[PDB]
């Protein structure tokens, strides 16, 4: 008890060298599309056509 005055809990924890995500980066396919010039008209004061 006498020595306990000078003490304080130290923060040390166990961990792993690497921790992986719950769900990995599932890859996605490349689907070709043409250049669509009408995809920014809902941002700001758009000018449709």
């Amino acid at each position: 008890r006498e020595i306990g005055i000078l003490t304080t809990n130290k923060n040390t924890s166990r961990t792993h060298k690497i921790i992986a995500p719950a769900n990995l980066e599932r890859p996605v396919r490349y689907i070709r599309k043409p250049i669509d010039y009408t995809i920014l008209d809902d941002i700001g004061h758009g000018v449709k056509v």
Partner: protein
């Protein structure tokens, strides 16, 4: 009593003699019914009727009067050594007692042999001495010694060190800019040497201020090292209680085996060694209560989830309540830059003082004061929260940077430039290490934008 009339380095010879005495008691006990060695030792140490014993009292006396003011720390080897030209010779230790050879190691030849064996521990203090000190002082003595060291540091910081700080703050320059690179390295050295002339020529500096700073640094280093030794003994004590407490090691499961069932087989192999259940099954209620209490004491040690150094540092921070340390509020409302009203600038000036090469007839700072001086200075800087400002704003670091840039070398007021920058670099390394350790052990003011008229 033979310990009480010798320096701190004789603790090893003390525990050696105590072990000889314990072996003698064990041998004679085969035929005679004597008092337990613990009872005899406590009676001889005055530790029966009183909390602390003679050994710990002399340990504290030695610390205070001979260890803090006379020893020099070495960071790399982790050892203390006595200073050259010692500052204190007023110890006046008790006169050595004498007796027949059979009260010492046992005979004239044995006395000579053991004296020769233990004479090797006399001219340094290191890990072995701390092991013996911890092992002999226990929690009681360790706690009391640390409290008394805290009192010593409080007395020193709010006493003589404060007065010298105030005086030197009066003597320091009011404003000191860090010149530009274009000024040159020789010019910058000359400028610094002119500005800090009064501090450089202060006679009592190196002989009083540095002495007290060395004392403070030695005290904090002792606290750190003694804590490390205590932890190292606690871990070993726990490694020996494992069999009777069921702490098995991780076992190697070969191909086609189950770790859980394997560990269960190992546990049931060793189940006869487990003490508490065995006494519970076969013992008496009083025996069971005592066994439970003893097991609880045994398994709970400071090494597993407690620390002491940080509390010491916080307590020491509580001592710097005078306004001289931190100074007045900055004019621009952010931080002082060209002013010298904060402790870290005083320490920069002192660093300039002791980074200058000295004559051969004189002693260097590490020859007289060791590493405790810098531990004390960097502790004071870090506790006040001035470490980063110190790093950014510092005369010696600035000179080192500019000289590295332009790569000049001359002599200014009999101070070679290249040697001085080399010394500055060495001390920069040491200071960075100390600051980093102190930061490790310790684990917003917003501003308003302009308003349109």
């Amino acid at each position: 009593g033979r310990f009480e009339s010798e320096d701190l380095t004789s603790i090893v010879e003390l525990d050696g003699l105590l072990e000889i005495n314990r072996m003698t008691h064990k041998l004679l006990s085969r035929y005679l019914t004597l008092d337990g060695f613990d009872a005899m030792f406590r009676e001889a140490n005055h530790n029966v009727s009183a909390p602390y014993g003679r050994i710990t009292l002399h340990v504290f006396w030695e610390l205070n009067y001979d260890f803090l003011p006379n020893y020099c720390y070495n960071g790399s080897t982790n050892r203390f050594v006595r200073t050259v030209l010692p500052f204190s010779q007023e110890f006046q230790r008790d006169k050595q007692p004498n007796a027949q050879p059979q009260y010492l190691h046992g005979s004239k030849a044995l006395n000579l042999a053991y004296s020769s064996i233990y004479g090797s521990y006399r001219n340094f203090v290191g890990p072995p001495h701390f092991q013996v000190i911890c092992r002999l002082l226990g929690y009681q003595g360790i706690a009391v010694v640390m409290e008394e060291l805290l009192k010593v540091v409080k007395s020193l910081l709010q006493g003589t060190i404060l007065q010298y700080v105030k005086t030197l703050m009066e003597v320091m320059p009011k404003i000191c800019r860090l010149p530009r690179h274009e000024y040159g390295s020789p010019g910058i050295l000359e400028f610094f040497h002119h500005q800090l002339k009064d501090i450089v020529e202060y006679a009592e500096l190196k002989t009083v201020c540095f002495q007290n700073l060395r004392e403070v640094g030695n005290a904090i280093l002792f606290c750190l090292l003694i804590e490390q030794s205590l932890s190292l003994e606690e871990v070993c004590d726990l490694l020996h209680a494992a069999p009777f407490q069921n702490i098995l090691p991780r076992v190697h499961v070969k191909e086609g085996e189950r770790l859980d069932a394997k560990m269960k087989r190992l546990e049931s192999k060793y189940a006869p060694l487990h003490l508490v259940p065995l006494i519970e099954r076969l013992g008496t209620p009083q025996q069971i209560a005592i066994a439970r209490e003893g097991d609880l004491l045994t398994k709970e040690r400071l090494c597993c989830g407690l620390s002491m150094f940080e509390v010491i540092l916080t307590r020491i921070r509580s001592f710097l309540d005078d306004p001289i340390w931190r100074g007045p509020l900055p004019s621009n409302g952010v931080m002082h830059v060209d002013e010298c009203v904060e402790f870290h600038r005083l320490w920069s000036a002192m660093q300039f003082v002791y980074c200058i090469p000295v004559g051969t007839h004189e002693f260097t700072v590490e020859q007289c004061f060791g590493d405790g001086l810098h531990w004390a200075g960097c502790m004071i800087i870090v506790l006040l929260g001035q470490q980063r400002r110190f790093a950014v704003l510092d005369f010696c670091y600035h000179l080192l940077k500019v000289q590295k840039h332009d790569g000049k070398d001359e002599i200014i007021k009999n101070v070679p430039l290249k040697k001085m920058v080399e010394r500055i670099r060495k001390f920069q390394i040491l200071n960075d290490e100390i600051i980093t350790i102190l930061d490790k052990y310790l684990k917003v003011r917003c501003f308003q934008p302009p308003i349109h008229q």
